[PDB]
Structures are given as C-alpha cells and as structure tokens.
Nucleic acid binder design. Sequence first.
DNA 1: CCTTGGCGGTTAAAACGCGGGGGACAGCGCGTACGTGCGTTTAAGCGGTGCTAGAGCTGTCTACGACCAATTGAGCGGCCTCGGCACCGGGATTCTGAT
DNA 2: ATCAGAATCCCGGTGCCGAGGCCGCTCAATTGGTCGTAGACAGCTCTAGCACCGCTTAAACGCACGTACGCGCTGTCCCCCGCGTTTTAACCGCCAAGG
Lengths: 80, 78, 103, 105, 97, 97, 95, 93
Amino acid sequence: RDNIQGITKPAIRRLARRGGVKRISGLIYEETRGVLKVFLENVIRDAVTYTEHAKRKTVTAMDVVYALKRQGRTLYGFGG
Amino acid sequence: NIQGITKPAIRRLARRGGVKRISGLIYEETRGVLKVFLENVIRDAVTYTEHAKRKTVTAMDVVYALKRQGRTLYGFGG
Amino acid sequence: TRSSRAGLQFPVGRVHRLLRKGNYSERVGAGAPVYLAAVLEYLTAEILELAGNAARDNKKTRIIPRHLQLAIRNDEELNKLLGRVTIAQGGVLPNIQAVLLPK
Amino acid sequence: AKTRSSRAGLQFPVGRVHRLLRKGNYSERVGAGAPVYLAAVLEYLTAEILELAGNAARDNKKTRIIPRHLQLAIRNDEELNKLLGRVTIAQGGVLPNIQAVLLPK
Amino acid sequence: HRYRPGTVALREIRRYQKSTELLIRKLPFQRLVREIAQDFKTDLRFQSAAIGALQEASEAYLVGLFEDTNLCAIHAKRVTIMPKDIQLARRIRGERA
Amino acid sequence: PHRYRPGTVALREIRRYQKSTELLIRKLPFQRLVREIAQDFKTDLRFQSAAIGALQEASEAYLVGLFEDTNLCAIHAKRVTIMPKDIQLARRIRGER
Amino acid sequence: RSRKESYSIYVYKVLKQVHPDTGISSKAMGIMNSFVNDIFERIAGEASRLAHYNKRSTITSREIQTAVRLLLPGELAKHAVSEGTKAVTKYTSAK
Amino acid sequence: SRKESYSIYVYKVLKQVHPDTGISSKAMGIMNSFVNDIFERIAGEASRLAHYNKRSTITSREIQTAVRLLLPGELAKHAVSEGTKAVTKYTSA
DNA sequence: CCTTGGCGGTTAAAACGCGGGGGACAGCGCGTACGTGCGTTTAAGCGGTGCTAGAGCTGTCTACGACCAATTGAGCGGCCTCGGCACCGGGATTCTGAT
DNA sequence: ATCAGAATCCCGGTGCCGAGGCCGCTCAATTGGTCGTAGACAGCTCTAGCACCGCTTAAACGCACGTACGCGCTGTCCCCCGCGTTTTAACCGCCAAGG
C-alpha cells in the first residue's frame, strides 16, 4: 500500500541532479511517479508472461533481460 | 541539384505537418536532414543490391533497408 | 483441406510450409498454424471492420487506403501496434491545433 | 596447425562459433570460412573497445577496468555511440555533462 | 481584396490534410536521388518502384518531423518554428549522437 | 558553517552525482513497489534479487533519459524551472505512452 | 514466369463476410498482404525466441499463445486468445 | 554447470592489447553480453539476406555484407580489411 | 522484358516584387514559488535464525512429428463487362472581413 | 451584429477502366502408413527466498525564511504571409535500343 510514495521526494531530487536538472518544481514529482508506474507495468507484464510460459513459480533475472530485449532498451551485465 | 526541393513544396509539407508560419532557415535545415536520411537509406539499399550482385535497385532492397532502420513501410509487398 | 476442418478462411498448409522454409525452429507442431490462422483472421477482421466504418464515413463503396490510414490511426491499440509503420498513400489525421485558431 | 584458431592466427575460437552457428536456425548449411570471418570481426570490435577502456583506466590511473570506465569509453567515441545508443550498461552513470546556461555568470 | 494572415494558412492546412497524393513531384526528386546514389557506384539503373517508395518515405518522415517541431515551437511559447526546434526534436529522437 | 546563495548546492550535487556511480532510489521501497504491481497480475510470486536490481537499473536509465530530454526542453524554452508540460512534450516526441 | 503468391482471395472472403456491401481496391489488398506478412514475421520471431529461451524446439500452440499475448496490446490479445483457443478446440475435437 | 562463457578469450585479447591491465567480473559479464549481442545481430541479418536472395546456406560473403549493413563507414572498412586478411591467411595456409 | 532517353508542347508551378501587420523580442515589475538549514523525525539496512517452495537434475516412455508416395481440387494465369467513381458545370451554402 | 462576396460543399452527368466474375488447368496440400526421439512426467535434493528480529544510524521532514526566476504587461521592429506578375520546367506522349 502507497509504495508509489516509497519513491521519495529526495529520490526524485537525486535522479534529477544526476541527469542534470537544476530547478525542480513541486508538480513534477507525482507525474514522475506515474511515468515510473506505467513503465514498470509494461515491464512486469512481460516478465510475468515469460515466467508463466516457463511453468515456474519464480521470476528470474534472465526473463527480465529477455523482456527488455523485447522492448528495445537492452540491458547488459547481468547475463544473456 | 538539391534545389529541385522548392520553397513552396517545403511549405506544403509544413502545412500537412501542422505548422502555421515558417521562418527562413528551416529550408536549409530541412535540406540537410533530408540529405542525411536519404544517404543512410541509399547506402543500405545499395549494400543489399551489391549482395544481390545486380545493377538495378529493387523495390525490395528499399523495403528491407527501411526494415533495417526500424521504419517499416507497407504497400509494396515486403 | 484442413481449413474448413477448423472453419476459417486462411490456409493451414501454406502457413505450415512457411514455418519450415523460414527455419523458425526445427519442427512444427500440429495445431499451431491453425492457432496462428485464427489470430491473423481476427486481426484482419477488426481492421477491415474499422475500414468499413471509414468507408461509411466518406460514403464510398470500395475501400481506398486513406480509409485504411484513418481507421488504423483512430483506434488506440491499432495506433499502438501500427504506429511505427507508415503506410503508402496514407496521409495523416484531420488535425488542427486549437491554440493556433484565430479569434 | 591443428586448431583452426591457430590456422587463422586469432583468439576467438572459430570452433565454438561453429557449434553455435550449427544450433542457430540460420540457414541449412554453414560454410567453413564464414565463422573465421565472423571471429575476426568480433576480435576487432573487442580490441576497439578495450583500447578505449585502457585509455579510460589510464586517465584515472586505475588498474582494474571498472564499468564506469567502460561507459565513459563508449560515450567518448562517436561511432560507438551511434551503434550502441539504444544499449544501456549497468553500473554506468552518464557523461560528466554540464549545460551552458546552468553555470552561474 | 486582401485577407487576414491565418485565413489562407489554416485553410490550406485543412485543404492539405485530406489528399495523400505526393507533393514533392517526380523528376527533380528523381534527379536528386540519382545524384545522391551516384557516389556509391557508377551508373546504377533504377526501378520506378524504389523511387516511389523513397518519395513516400521522405514525405511521411518530414510530416512526422514537422509534427514534433511544431509541438516544440508551441511549447516554448511561440507560434512560428525556427531551426533550433528541429535541432531539439532530432536531439530527442536520438539521431544526433 | 555558513549559507550562500541558492545554486552552489545544485552544482555541487551535479558534480557529486556525476562523480558517483551507484543507485539513487533505495532498495526496499522499490522492492515493495515491484511486488505491489506484480501481485496484481499473478498471485504469490517469488523473486531473484538480481532481477529487482535490473529493474532498478532500467528504471534509473529511463528516468535519466526522460530528465535529459526534459532539461533540453526547458533550456530550449528559456526557462530553468521545469514544469510537467515539459514532460508532456518529451513523452510526446519519444512517442512512448 | 515465376508463380508468385498473395493473400487476395482469403482476405477478400473475410471482407465479404463482415461487409458484404463493400468493395476494395487492389492497392489496399497489397497493403493488407504486407500487413499480414509483418504480423506473421513478428509472431515467428517471438516464437523463435521462446524456443531459444526455453531450451526446446517443439513449437506447440502454447508458445504461439504467449507470443500473441506479448506482441499485441491487451484486450485485443484477449479476444485473440479467445479466437485461437476456440479454433484449436473445434479443430482437435473433430478431425 | 558447464555454462560456457567468453572469459579467457577476452583475457587473451586484453593481454595482447594492454598487457598489464586487470579487469573485474561484472565488466567481463558486460563484454560477454556485448559479444552475444553482436553475434545475434550479425547472424540474424545474415539469415535475413539468405531468405532475401533465397540462398539456403552461409558463406563468408553474407557476413561481409552484413557487417557492411550494421556498422557505419570507418569501423566497417577496418572490419572488412581484418576479415579479408584473416580469411586469406586461413585460405592459403 | 524493362529502363533510359530524346524531343515537342504545354500550363501550372515556382520565382520574384512588395507592403503591412502582426508575431518575436526586450525590458521590467514583482512577488510569490521554492532553495537552504535544522533540529526533528523516519526507517533502511546490515547482520543473524531458521524454514521449505520449488528450481533443477535424472530417467522413461510413448506419443506425436519427419518423412514417403499417390492425388485432386482449389488457385492461379488469362479474359471480359460493368458500374463506381474522377471529374464537368451549377447552385447553394458557409465562412470571414469591411462595415 | 451586417452584409458582400469569394471559397467550398454538393448535386446531377459521364464514360471508362480496374474489380470482379468466369474458364482451363496443375502442383501443392491431402491422406495415410512407418519410423524415432523429444518431452511430459515422477521422484530427489538441496538452494535460495522468505519471514522475522535488534540495533543502529544515516537519511527523510515541516517549516521558517529569504529570494529569484516565472510570468504578466508594455513597447518595439521588420519578417513573413499573402497577392500581382513574369518566367519556366515537370509532365504527357511518343518512339526506340539495348542491356
């Protein structure tokens, strides 16, 4: 419950500073939380898809990598 | 050469694209971006044609080259 | 044929040939191209449905590809799938930015 | 020379490439010089990246190459940025990048 | 007599969001494409179908580019485009590295 | 032990974080967010930890790319105060919805 | 004189089912043929990667099902799973 | 198990480029994912060309024009030179 | 069989002159939206303690696919006729600007 | 508003030209039998995930407070948008040749 606010205001501030943002408004935060939510929706839909077709009750990192390969946002480093 | 791309045709493309009023240097910027994109496409097309060992650019080389761009086009049987 | 043995309009044999001459795996299962034929026919059914409504829009009987383009772009999910594929003779939607409208 | 690696004088083993190309569903038959050509191209690309990796480890005077060095080495090239732009490496970070109007006048 | 500005412009936006016939006409665009291709191999013959496909692809790609350009130029509180809008949009789409 | 004008802390955080490497969003709230969205599609999952770290990596990548495009839109609009219509323009022009 | 193929008659019969008082241009038929070829290659590639990431090579209809739910947007894929499962049952219960 | 990787091969590459430079485990994993990515890209593009001219086998020429397709100009030219040199050296010897 | 290419005639497309007016830009007020600290509060996380779904390996066995050989009936090349539609002229409407 | 008046839609006409109906035929999909091997499945084992606990400690918080950039308003100035005019080349149509 309410784990979208587990994304803290200083976390959005920190990711703004790493990306290069200087002046952060107050209306940005929940829009950022919503975009993060939609992204995680599509990704975990594909992850559960590959998990169910594995016929295994555990989600692996390899499945996450393969789903990201299905996106176009390919992640190296963790195998596959 | 490049100047078959007339000013009012670029204006018509701005009309269909949704643009009301046009500056001046849009013309040169459009010619530059147009030239870059056509260079990439024709290089992939003639690479397909040179693997086909033939002298004439097919439609199919164009279609699969735009497939390679992630810019898939229908209508021409690919 | 096997087509009316599942009651469709798309063949099973041609698709079963294409799954071997595409080298998409080693072997091809029994009913999987039937499944694929059903999927394809449902897709083109929805497409030609909205295409027919687009034909009703400009009051024509034979489908012109502008009607195809508008029917693809109007639906949300059909603009999601076929958004990265432009279509020859397609055009775009009737689109006017309201912030450009004169007073 | 017994091994085809020695017959090619390269280091990426052409035989393991050949085994993966047989179980690859790519054509019916696989030639005998194509995995040689492919292993040469892969060796050239790995050298092309590890060169900039060595330069990145040398710019910070660090011995073991870390993935930060890898990310900086990828973004410092222009052609390797044009290739791998839709690729995102873990542990990377980004370029040290500051815009124009952000610095205090 | 004379109209006001925006009458003719938006009227032709209406008049040109309906016909999908090509606007960059055939022969100068053809001479341009042969000029571009000339520096890849000498004296290559052309089908008409490849020329038609690249003509369609060119006009469609510039339609999409102009859409993102005009959305930038309105979003930065202006009405008329300028080439740094195109630079901004192409920087967004990841063509310029 | 002093206070200066607003902006020095900003550039100091930019330098400190472009020097830094690792995660900005912490682990456990991100884990519980993933489990919240994950249970709503299938009941009673079990997870590899590296999978969740990969999710975190992709999330940070996507947000950093969105912020880079947002800041480019802002600096284009002659503003430094970003507003949510900048993110509107950004996720319009990337076309990812 | 190579005997080339298309999909004109099958899609044309589908059109005559759902819209009997409706014609079609042949250009649109080429468009739809390209469309079906695209959909077919995408489903083939997803079935391919399913076969690779499962360490098997026997393509059942279940792999095609999970590829259908991947590639297509949600509710349309739900109806697609309905159509596919119905066709599987009607083809395998009878002969 | 016998999960085969590309570890010692890129170790030999690094010893024959920067001969006194170490490297980490996860960086080697990044290199492994890199080689598998480029391998799948070139093999898939070669299979596409095999179907696009209806030629059911693979020679080196498809690989040559495939790396012409993927990489842009200068790196492609160097890779073509490297591949032709290694192929000719494997050919005559 | 399809691509180039030479020539003649044209009308529409573009180039160019031109004026004015309205949009971009500067400046500035201002003031309220938000960076910065600071104690004040929150809770992450790091290390221990067990538990046991379930991932994964091993064997098996058979049940489904790869393929061999005849076949046949739809699909495909070709050929016609039509009626749907681009376009021609009229009238009516529907916008917008001078007023 | 208020009307004059171009711009555009819209309605009957038309002929003509691709869409579709139809004929002749052929080869690919069908049927069916035979082999073989992959995978579904049952059982094992032991690994990692999970839930939970103690303590801590570094990090998030509300708000006071200054302050600076966002934004509204006004003024400027010349850049395009639009229209009359002159030039001009893309296109249509034909007609070979030759690769």
